[PDB]
Design a protein around this ligand. Sequence first.
Ligand code: HEC
Length: 104
Amino acid sequence: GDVEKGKKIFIMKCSQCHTVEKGGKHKTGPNLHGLFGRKTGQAPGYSYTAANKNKGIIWGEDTLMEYLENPAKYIPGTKMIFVGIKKKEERADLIAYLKKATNE
Ligand code: HEC
């Protein structure tokens, strides 16, 4: 994925509710640092829905590709109220950005 395009997508579509950096604040949604390889619903200090806590899968490229296409379809009961990103290439770019930013 194209990390520079992904950053712009993150800013436009996600930053209102999320931070990615180490020690970043929680906002409407949880800080996303350390996301990859973690089970759903595990950011310290954030109050998740039971649905997000119980989904029970590991975040990675594939599971994010599916989640970000339609969040509430993947996690029914989620409080993340966001339509999703329809185009596969846009999801791949965003995910490439997340994979970098949430791990440095
Ligand atoms: C822009 C496309 C994004 C991306 C990449 C993510 N979000 Fe959100 N998000 C929001 C809230 C309230 C939650 C918690 C939901 C709940 O407890 O039910 C989330 C959760 C996520 C996750 C899961 C994190 C985990 O630790 O399991 C992920 C990967 C994620 N988001 C990515 C709120 C919002 C928004 C507020 C209106 C918006 C916009 C977004 N999220 C957008 C995005």
